[PDB]
Amino acid sequence: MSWLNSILVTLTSVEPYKVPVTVIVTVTFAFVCFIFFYLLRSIRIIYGLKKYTRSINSIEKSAPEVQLEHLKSLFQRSELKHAWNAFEASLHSQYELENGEEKIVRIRATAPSASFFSEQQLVDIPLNTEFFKHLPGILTGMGIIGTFYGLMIGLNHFDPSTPEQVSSSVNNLLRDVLYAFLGSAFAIFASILVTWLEKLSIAKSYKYLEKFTAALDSLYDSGVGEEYLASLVKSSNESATQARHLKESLVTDLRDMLLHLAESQKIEN
Amino acid sequence: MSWLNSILVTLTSVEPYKVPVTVIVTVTFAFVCFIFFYLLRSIRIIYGLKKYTRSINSIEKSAPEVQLEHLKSLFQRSELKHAWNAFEASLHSQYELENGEEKIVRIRATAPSASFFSEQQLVDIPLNTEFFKHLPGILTGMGIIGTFYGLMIGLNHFDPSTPEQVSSSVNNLLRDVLYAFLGSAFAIFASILVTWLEKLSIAKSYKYLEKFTAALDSLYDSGVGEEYLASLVKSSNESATQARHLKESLVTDLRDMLLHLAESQKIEN
Amino acid sequence: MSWLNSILVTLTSVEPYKVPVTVIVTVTFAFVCFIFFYLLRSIRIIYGLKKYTRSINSIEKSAPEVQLEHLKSLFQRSELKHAWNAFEASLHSQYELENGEEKIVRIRATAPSASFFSEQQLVDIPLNTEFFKHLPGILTGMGIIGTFYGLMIGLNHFDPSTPEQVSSSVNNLLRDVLYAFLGSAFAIFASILVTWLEKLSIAKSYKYLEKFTAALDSLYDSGVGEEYLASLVKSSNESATQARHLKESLVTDLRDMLLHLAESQKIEN
Amino acid sequence: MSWLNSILVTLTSVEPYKVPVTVIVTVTFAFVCFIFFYLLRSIRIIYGLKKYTRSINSIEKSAPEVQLEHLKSLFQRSELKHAWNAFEASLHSQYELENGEEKIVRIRATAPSASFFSEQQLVDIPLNTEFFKHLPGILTGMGIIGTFYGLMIGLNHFDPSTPEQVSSSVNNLLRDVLYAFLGSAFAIFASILVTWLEKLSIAKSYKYLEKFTAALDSLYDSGVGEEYLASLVKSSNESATQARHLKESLVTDLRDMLLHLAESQKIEN
Amino acid sequence: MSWLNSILVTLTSVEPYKVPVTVIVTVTFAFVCFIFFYLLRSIRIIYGLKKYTRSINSIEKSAPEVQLEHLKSLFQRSELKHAWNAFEASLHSQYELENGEEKIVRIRATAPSASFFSEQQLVDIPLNTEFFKHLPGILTGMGIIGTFYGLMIGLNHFDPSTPEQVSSSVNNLLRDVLYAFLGSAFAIFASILVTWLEKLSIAKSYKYLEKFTAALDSLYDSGVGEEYLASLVKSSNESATQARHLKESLVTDLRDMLLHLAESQKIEN
Amino acid sequence: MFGNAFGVKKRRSDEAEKPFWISYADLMTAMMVLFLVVMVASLSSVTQRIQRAEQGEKARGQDISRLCERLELHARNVNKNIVVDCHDNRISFGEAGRFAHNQFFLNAEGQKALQDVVPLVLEASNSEEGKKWFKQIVIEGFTDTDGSYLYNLHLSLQRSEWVMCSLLDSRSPLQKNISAEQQLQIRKLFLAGGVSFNNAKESKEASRRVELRMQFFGLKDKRDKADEVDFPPVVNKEVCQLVMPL
Amino acid sequence: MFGNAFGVKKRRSDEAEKPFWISYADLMTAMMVLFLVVMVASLSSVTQRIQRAEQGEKARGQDISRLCERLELHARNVNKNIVVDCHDNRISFGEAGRFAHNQFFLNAEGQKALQDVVPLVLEASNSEEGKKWFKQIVIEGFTDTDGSYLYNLHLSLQRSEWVMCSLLDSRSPLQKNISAEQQLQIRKLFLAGGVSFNNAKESKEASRRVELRMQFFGLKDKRDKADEVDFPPVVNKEVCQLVMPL
Ligand SMILES: CCCCCCCCCCCCCCCCCC(=O)OC[C@H](COP(=O)([O-])OCC(O)COP(=O)([O-])OC[C@@H](COC(=O)CCCCCCCCCCCCCCCCC)OC(=O)CCCCCCCCCCCCCCCCC)OC(=O)CCCCCCCCCCCCCCCCC
Ligand SMILES: CCCCCCCC/C=C/CCCCCCCC(=O)OC[C@H](COP(=O)(O)OCCN)OC(=O)CCCCCCC/C=C/CCCCCCCC
Ligand SMILES: CCCCCCCC/C=C/CCCCCCCC(=O)OC[C@H](COP(=O)(O)OCCN)OC(=O)CCCCCCC/C=C/CCCCCCCC
């Protein structure tokens, strides 16, 4: 196919220095994209999570209603609004009648806060970790493409026709290999650096998200259905007991009242 | 072995330009299949999820029967009909006595909407993510096969007998491997592009599915069992109190009728 | 050392054609084992899932009993008998007294059907996915072993020690490297073929297992505990009301009886 | 500095054959450790699981107390004692009053058997799969280290100070490369074999563990809470009518009593 | 290009020996960081978990309040205090009346201890496993970079002007390759050593954390809700029987009072 | 029913890049580097003798070019008639060296050019480059193939003898500005004789010319000492034996 | 609490292997093999170039030595006075080639030897080795360093001219013995050379001698028609210039 022959002849003639330049520019663009879309956003998320955790720990000793108001005001303005709404919907408010009004005396947790402030929604989707965990491999592939191409250019240009041309051919081949190795070096160093930065940032993100969800989970205690069932069982037991006692008391009252009626009838007679 | 030499002559008799074209055509077919069956499908899924979330957020303030009927009509002619049917079967409707009839005043959620509009059913199964996440590896493998085949073509025709034959054989081998690496570089570029597109699409699909399920979850409140148990405990306490008060009232009234009967019979006497 | 030298002599004395031949034979055997134990097995599983789903959808409008014996006959004589027994043990039968006998009027679901017809038990264990997901890596490793061992053989042949026989050494080295790369290319080809087939099969198996599970889920409705709790709450409210009304009615009856007794006493007087 | 040159002189002073010997010995020791701590252990686990499953299937038709005591004896002189204690603690015993004493009539399961006889506790932790799934990488790394060391030795020996000494130097360097590649290939072959055996053992262990947990799950039925709620609803519905009937019967009996008293009073008067 | 030449002359301006010294120093620093932040931390975690398990096993035969106090003091001043607080919030204490006041007779678990003493919170976060599991790849990549950078230095300084300059440049290139071999061998050795230690530590940590959570789960039994429901059902049946018995006893006793009143009236008359 | 809402979990923990592949890429890169550097070393070693010979040849070429440039600059500075062709190490006197038919004389321009160029070549040879690479000066004679061979060759040799006489004849202007050492050097560095046939020019009159062509030592000769001979000091002035009046 | 313990599990998907370090390692295996093949092939090729050049030069030298050997054997067969030296590619006259003062002609034995050696040179140039490497024959004149330099130079030139006349004189036996083609070959081969004064050991009888030496092409030289000067066919006899009474 003549088109393939034309492409081959037109890319044998590419200047060898243009391949490391292309690799370096593309890898630099990928690294800048990594910094903008992953590292800065991860730092921002970590700082926000730490601020949230400090805010939650400041109402550990507050009343349930003021705690709810504080958390609503904390989360209603930020991206963690629907997660907070779901978490609050999962909460159970216990009411006790005080001074003729029903007031929330305790709030109970029916599900862990991590089921609403999930690692996915709060970290993975915002940071595109699913993709950025492949970025070091992308950089490695760019490096191998550039390196293999540069070494191929050097090898095509290497042809000592006589023993007297060996020196210049060796020099040109070494220059070409230098270009290819520069491209490969930058690409692989960028890959390693991106791996280091992204793994450290994702570890910190997960740690501080766990701290945040643990702070949320410590506000409200679970197991409200178990205590409701225990109260029901107790109330049933004293319900049988009180039924028996009420029957006995009614019998005693009826006996006494009938004796009084008999005495009154005797007095009248 | 004669069979090995026979297949090595058949495979190395292919024109060297046919390795890059075979690799490029196969990788392009895989990429077109990826676009058609994964990327466009994911875009349609994301668009539909956005439209559904817009529709659900418009019936936030509606009466529970009205919004139930709206959601019903929203999904029957849709691909989410089965998921909506399961979700609606999981709903708990609370009836109250108005005008001598039991009408729904509140519809409750016994299970989260994500349990039915799951990531699997709505994204992974439609997009065949169990397969397409391994496509970049397949493209890379096909590129590697192309390079190895070009290398084998170059090696099988190498003639080192004479220096001129050495030079011509080196030239031919480098040319064949250069065709092959054209194919392989195309494969690696396509693998990178497929990786980026696939990860981004899965990210956005999960993000907007989460938004959709959060919109659905906000319509119906959970935790109705805990409310029922709390009501049962309160009713048990109030029923014990009512039993004691009713016994006391019965005793007082019986005293009253006995006194009245005594007075009447005294008057008759 | 004599031991290592004898080992090297034994390894490098084999005919160089036996390396690609051994790699190809072992990879072909692994591929045939994959076809027999994974691909055909997955096809049979998918066909059975389709048949079961078609059978389940046929009793979508049947009576709860008729559905129950139909599902018993469909499953208890197959490989899903234990899963069906577990799922049926999870089913809750609601009884109603009609015509002097207790009959099932409704069957409720307490757990999802995917809990008992799980992906593991129905797909991953019969397909031995814990082993076959690693098979492409094993094939590629075998190709790499062939590459290394063929390179050793070729480098062993390269010891001319005479300019007259240098060309023969180069020919032998080229042939041995050609053999090694034949084996490696075949191994990589079969690795990507196995990857393609196994991922497509596992995706289709998950798709149709999800359809089968959805078909089972649609038969029975959940949330029976919630409606039981609602019935208990309603009954407790009506119980308090009926208790006070029966107290009032007992008071009225006692009053009427005492007036009648007074009237009879007046007649006697 | 000169420290680097000194440690290079020390490192490359060893004979080339000692490197493949060391690699082979270390890789063989690691393989023997794999066989001892992993493969034989997994075989013993599989045999024990099959024996336990056979034992459990024998008591399928026994009385609940007989089954419970048989399972206690089965898993008390065994490594599964903690899992069995947890699973038995999760079992609900239904007592009924027979012959004046509370006797177990049915045992109900509240959690799946695999929740306590989990894959981690029975397979992953005993086999240390968190370590042994990375052993092939360690073997390959050891082989690569040996290859690098042998290449160091061979390159150090390479010094063609004379045009006539070039062929001998190249041949010796190729021999050293052969030794290094021998070490690498042995390590890679051992890694592939270890991967094969490990993955097959994991697949078989998971299969037979699932069979064991399915045998345990089939003994006892779940959903006891739902039938408890159904019984509660039935009791409340019956108790409303029972209270009404008791009140009516008490009123009728009191009417008959007062009529008899009036007749006796008439006779006495 | 001028920019490329300037970058090359700046990067290559390093003395050839500082590239092996850098890889070795960087790899050793990474290994020391691994030892300090992962291995010593993991050893302390394992030792603490074993001591905690011993303490828990020592308290298994004590009273519920004594066990609670021992576990409070055990974890309150440690890093497991949040996990213990969550676990105790998940505990359900059963109160009974013994000599006038409420006394805890039993404590029941509503969730497994591993829900709060999770592998994440207790091992993966404090050990930064999400980072350190990628360290060996970083080390190997740092070996590859060092190879590339040393070869870049060697190739950029090749001087073909004079035959002895050619000899010096050739010797420098050979020394650079020896340096690259040494650095790569060191990096891979450290990477596999880190892998071995990391995976051994993580396996031991998981094993002993599982032992710790199994020890905690042994203290308290689950399934208290089913017991409460069974008690409620038994109480409902006995309450129906008791109400009927109370009505019968009441009507018989008032029959006794009415007969006694008639007899007394007859005697008085 | 009573299922635990607070369950044991496990996140999406992605497993790292397999160590074997990065290690094997490192090993393959190291092997490729090794083979490149071994090829470079082997090719340099097998051709190091060729490289040394080529460097020596280039150095000799540079030295010869420098000497030719110096001599040409001296000729330009002193006598414009002297033109030197450095491509083939030739000194030409075309206009002043035209020879008429059946004669071996030249105009005064040729005599001035020769007596002016001889000291320049002497001082060039006395330099280190001349003392290391400059051999004796070869006299060129050109003849045509037409006519009688013997008569044309006799004309050429008479021309050469006349040139040698004019170089070393008594009463010559060159001898007035000469020393004994310079005369001895001229006698040593000049040899007479040589006939040639060429068809590279379109004019038969072009062959009627005399040109000075110097030759240089070879690399493997390197100024052998035993080749040189000696001459007794000049005692009587040289007298030409050719027919000056004709 | 209100959830179910019999819930769905395994909600995790298997990760795909990273394919890019695999591509790096495999492409680097291919490039490593490329460099190994290029290393071995280039080493073999360069060594073969060097050995081929060395053996070509050796074969040329052996053929030249064989040509000198056969020429010397033929010379000994014809006349025993001819001295052939293959160690410098020169043929000299032992005793017949000597000259006295004011002498420009060889003796009768010298003339006979000069006439006899020419057909031997024709046979040498007619051989395959002659067709491959044989070059022209320069004639060097030698005279004692004593006496007048111009007198010695003119006498040597006269001797060389007389020798070439005896080669090509119509009255000489060579003209009536050789043919037109042989005459053209002689014209191509024999030509006039320089004059030397290599006098040593105070041997005036031996120093004043004239001999012919054989040069050859270069190994890197190229044969072309430009250097192949072809003389016109003989249309008239040639008469020598210097006359007997001189
Ligand atoms: C020396 C010779 C050789 C040199 C080469 C070195 C080669 C090494 C390569 C591999 C290294 C392996 C081990 C790394 C350690 C990580 C392990 C770990 O968990 O850390 C322990 C520990 C955190 O563990 P923890 O138990 O979670 O917390 C306890 C804390 O100690 C204290 O408690 P706390 O956490 O509550 O404290 C409050 C918190 C409050 O902070 C927060 O709340 C924020 C949370 C973190 C944000 C997200 C992190 C994202 C990553 C960095 C982002 C930008 C950095 C850009 C610059 C870096 C790359 C050049 O502040 C912090 O501690 C957070 C910041 C520090 C933690 C990160 C560890 C290292 C970070 C280094 C990056 C910056 C270096 C600047 C210049 C580097 C020049 C090479 O970190 C430290 O305290 C620091 C000691 C570790 C230093 C080693 C790293 C040095 C640089 C390595 C070279 C990088 C690539 C090579 C150079 C190429 C470019 C030319
Ligand atoms: C999809 C998996 C991998 C992705 C891409 C594969 C990369 C490698 C590509 C292989 C190149 C395939 C080229 C074949 C296309 C059409 C063949 C054709 O018509 O070419 C004619 C050509 C030249 O004509 P002749 O006159 O016979 O030759 C001169 C003297 N005998 O002859 C032939 O090709 C004859 C042989 C037929 C095809 C041979 C190759 C078979 C296919 C193999 C490639 C597919 C998988 C690779 C496996 C690798 C190791 C087995
Ligand atoms: C440390 C990064 C982590 C990863 C490391 C692993 C790879 C190992 C390879 C890198 C080795 C780097 C060389 C060591 C640094 C030495 C630089 C220094 O201080 O020298 C100053 C130096 C010259 O001094 P000398 O000539 O050596 O001393 C005087 C005697 N004539 O002056 C300069 O300005 C040159 C600076 C060049 C080095 C700068 C950094 C080089 C690269 C950075 C890290 C490596 C990754 C990059 C890969 C290649 C990217 C294209």
End-to-end CA distance of chain F: 145
Looking at the fold, whether D235 and D135 belong to one and the same domain comes out as no
Looking at the fold, whether C190 and C258 belong to one and the same domain comes out as no
Looking at the fold, whether B176 and B46 belong to one and the same domain comes out as yes
- How far apart CA A17 and CA E1 sit, in angstroms, is 7
Confirm whether F34 is domain-assigned. Answer: no
Q: Are B46 and B208 in contact (CB under 8 A)?
A: yes
Tokens representing G120 are 């031997």
Tokens representing C245 are 């009304």
B160 and G41 within 8 Å at the Cβ level: the answer is yes
- Report which secondary-structure segment, H or E, holds G123: helix G108-126
G34 and B188 within 8 Å at the Cβ level: the answer is no
Contact partners, residue B207, CB within 8 Å, separation at least 6:
A121, A125
F1 and C144 within 8 Å at the Cβ level: the answer is no
Among the listed residues F141, C161, B61, D169, the one whose alpha carbon sits nearest the alpha carbon of residue G161: F141
End-to-end CA distance of chain G: 145
Among the listed residues C218, C194, C167, C251, the one whose alpha carbon sits nearest the alpha carbon of residue C39: C194
Confirm whether E240 is domain-assigned. Answer: yes
Looking at the fold, whether C180 and C261 belong to one and the same domain comes out as no
Confirm whether F244 is domain-assigned. Answer: no
Chains touching chain G, criterion 3+ CB pairs below 8 Å: A, B, C, D, F
Confirm whether A190 is domain-assigned. Answer: yes
D35 CA → ligand 1 middle, Å:
40
- CATH code where residue F197 lies: 3.30.1330.60
Number of the ligand closest to the Cα of E126: 1
- How far apart CA C71 and CA C61 sit, in angstroms, is 13
Residues in F closer than 8 angstroms to G195, CB to CB, are 191-193
Confirm whether G19 is domain-assigned. Answer: no
Ligand 1 atom 92, closest CA: E30
Pocket of ligand 1 (CB under 6 A): A 43, 46, 50, 193, 196-197, 200-201, 204; E 25-26, 29-30, 33, 37, 128, 131, 135, 138
Contact partners, residue C43, CB within 8 Å, separation at least 6:
C201
Residue C212 lies in domain: 2-222
Ligand 1 atom 100, closest CA: A193
Q: Which of residues 19-38 of F touch G (CB under 8 A)?
A: 21-22, 24-25, 28-29, 31-32, 35-36, 38
E162 CA → ligand 3 middle, Å:
28
Neighbours of E185 (CB within 10 A): 24
Ligand 2 atom 22, closest CA: B14
CA angle A119, A122, A128 (to 5 degrees): 90
Any CB–CB contact under 8 A between D126 and chain G?
no
Q: Which residue has the tokens 């009626």?
A: A261
Going by the DSSP 8-state scheme, the letter that residue D47 receives in this structure is H
- How far apart CA G204 and CA G208 sit, in angstroms, is 6
Looking at the fold, whether C240 and C164 belong to one and the same domain comes out as no
Experimental determination technique: cryo-EM
Which of A44, A196, A207, A209 best tests ligand 1's pocket when mutated (most atoms within 8 Å of CB)?
A: A196
Confirm whether G36 is domain-assigned. Answer: no
Looking at the fold, whether E124 and E232 belong to one and the same domain comes out as no
Number of domains making up chain F: 1
Question: Ligand 3: which atom is nearest the Cα of residue E142?
Answer: 6
C225 and F1 within 8 Å at the Cβ level: the answer is yes
Indicate the pairing of strand F190-191 with strand G210-216. unpaired
Report DSSP letters for G212-231, one per residue.
EEEEE--SS----TTT---P
Confirm whether F143 is domain-assigned. Answer: yes
- How far apart CA E22 and CA E10 sit, in angstroms, is 17
Q: Which residue has the tokens 């067969």?
A: G77
Any CB–CB contact under 8 A between D149 and chain E?
yes
Which of F4, F6, F32, F54 best probes binding to A when mutated, by most A CB atoms within 10 angstroms? F6
Pocket of ligand 3 (CB under 6 A): A 182, 185-186, 189; E 10-11, 13-15, 18-19, 22-23, 26, 142, 145-146, 149
Q: Are E220 and E110 in contact (CB under 8 A)?
A: no
Q: Are D239 and C236 in contact (CB under 8 A)?
A: no
Among the listed residues A165, A160, G45, A159, the one whose alpha carbon sits nearest the alpha carbon of residue B165: G45
One-letter-per-residue 3-state SS of A144-175? HHHHHHHHHHHHHHCCCCCHHHHHHHHHHHHH
A177 → closest Cβ in E1, E155, E253: E155
Looking at the fold, whether E250 and E191 belong to one and the same domain comes out as no
Amino acid residing at A146: G
Looking at the fold, whether B209 and B242 belong to one and the same domain comes out as no
Looking at the fold, whether D123 and D29 belong to one and the same domain comes out as yes
Q: Are F9 and E118 in contact (CB under 8 A)?
A: yes
Number of domains making up chain B: 2
Among the listed residues F49, F72, F99, F119, the one whose alpha carbon sits nearest the alpha carbon of residue F208: F99
Any CB–CB contact under 8 A between C229 and chain B?
yes
Chains touching chain D, criterion 3+ CB pairs below 8 Å: C, E, F, G
- How far apart CA D246 and CA D240 sit, in angstroms, is 10
Looking at the fold, whether D169 and D143 belong to one and the same domain comes out as yes
Going by the DSSP 8-state scheme, the letter that residue G3 receives in this structure is B
Q: Are G68 and F72 in contact (CB under 8 A)?
A: no
Nearest CA in chain B to A264: B262
Among the listed residues D145, D175, D138, D17, the one whose alpha carbon sits nearest the alpha carbon of residue E183: D145
B19 CA → ligand 2 middle, Å:
7
Tokens representing D95 are 């007592």
C34: helix, strand or coil = helix
> Please, where are the H alpha helices in chain F?
19-46, 48-78, 108-126, 128-133, 149-167, 173-176, 180-189
- How far apart CA A145 and CA A139 sit, in angstroms, is 10
D188 CA → ligand 2 middle, Å:
31
- How far apart CA F52 and CA F23 sit, in angstroms, is 42
- How far apart CA D86 and CA D133 sit, in angstroms, is 29
Residues in C closer than 8 angstroms to F28, CB to CB, are none
D115 → closest Cβ in G5, G40, G43: G5
Among the listed residues G17, F216, B96, G40, the one whose alpha carbon sits nearest the alpha carbon of residue C173: G40
- How far apart CA C2 and CA C8 sit, in angstroms, is 10
Among the listed residues B168, D153, E153, F34, the one whose alpha carbon sits nearest the alpha carbon of residue G31: F34
Among the listed residues E34, E17, E39, the one whose alpha carbon sits nearest the alpha carbon of residue E191: E34
One-letter-per-residue 3-state SS of chain B? CHHHHHHHHHHCCCCCCHHHHHHHHHHHHHHHHHHHHHHHHHHHHHHHHHHHHHHHHCCCCCCHHHHHHHHHHHHCCCCCHHHHHHHHHCEEEEEEEECCEEEEEEEEECCCHHHCCCHHHHHHHHHCHHHHCCHHHHHHHHHHHHHHHHHHHHHHCCCCCCHHHHHHHHHHHHHHHHHHHHHHHHHHHHHHHHHHHHHHHHHHHHHHHHHHHHHHHHHCECCHHHHHHHHHHHHHHHHHHHHHHHHHHHHHHHHHHHHHHHHHHHHHC
Among the listed residues B208, F30, G134, the one whose alpha carbon sits nearest the alpha carbon of residue D184: F30
Ligand 2 atom 15, closest CA: B18
Looking at the fold, whether E80 and E187 belong to one and the same domain comes out as yes
Measured between alpha carbons, how far is residue G122 from residues G63, G116, G136, G190 in Å? 17, 11, 12, 11
Residue G143 lies in domain: 62-216
Interface of F with D (CB under 8 A): 1-2, 18-20, 23-24, 26-27, 30-31, 34, 38, 41-42, 45-49
Looking at the fold, whether C214 and C227 belong to one and the same domain comes out as no
Question: Ligand 2: which atom is nearest the Cα of residue C188?
Answer: 49
Among the listed residues D219, D214, D229, the one whose alpha carbon sits nearest the alpha carbon of residue D109: D219
B240 and A235 within 8 Å at the Cβ level: the answer is yes
D225 → closest Cβ in F2, F27, F49: F2
